[PDB]
DNA sequence: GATCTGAAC
DNA sequence: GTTCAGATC
């Protein structure tokens, strides 16, 4: 019994088909950093709508920015990732992994592989999180403490200032 | 007509010449310019569908964590950032090939920028600012680098996961 | 050469 | 519901 029949051009082409695909994964109970992580939320597959819904658990941290997360499915570690945004925005991003957008080439291959795999496995996903302490830093004589890299914050400050000065962004930019 | 197809998104519309920059802002009018220094130049290589680099500020070519400004004939084409050196960010722009856009495996940004710069076919001045990097602590170890704390935390956890378990999670490919 | 990861709207 | 940005192999 073959896992799939097509000849993948890359790993992200191969969508996981069931929980059986996780059988050689590492149990979350054997995760070495587990004492630093706390259950944050669950992701609920909604196949009809081709998206993941969120069951908020650690309510006080749902709007917290800058985390490492672990997706666990029936006790198995499916992935470890990070976000400078809250979990909700990162899940929003995973929800870009739709078949249509993959065909358009407008979603990341990661978001496609993860959303489609989670929808197909069709189990609720536990999300454990760790929120690192954020350093204070200085840019142009002002102090910041946030989830951003200093280069990203600097770019943001500069672009928002650029827009106020010239009432436009450069032609090569769309995001701020 | 600038082009003839109905684009579905901005990134679909590739700039055709330096004339497309006529309404852009001059680099001389950039308020943060005293913080920036000419780092390098990008040289379009249409035959190989890529950008080459001429290093200018040689001492800074391996510096990580920068804001950059791409300037063509005195006009600001874009402002961006990278936690890597400029060389790796350009490598990433060089992923913007037509084939990979068809594959859906490059970013739309890299496609738009590579294709537009190849078509404009001018040398691009790259101005750079390297912010100071804060020191931060994770799991009793201190770091001073260009990474966000969450990205550094992920990298440390992932490498130590691989040490302990001799594998990465099935859902991971990058470290 | 080519892909992977996450941010923004 | 859909595209935008950049890190990595
Ligand atoms: Cl400005
Ligand atoms: Na990651
Ligand atoms: Na940017």
UniProtKB/TrEMBL annotation, chain B:
Chain positions recorded as Ca(2+) 1 binding sites: 23
Molecular function as annotated in GO: metal ion binding
Binding-site residues, Ca(2+) 2: 81, 154
Keywords tagged on the record: Calcium, Metal-binding
Protein name in the entry: Hpy188I
Originating organism: Helicobacter pylori (Campylobacter pylori)
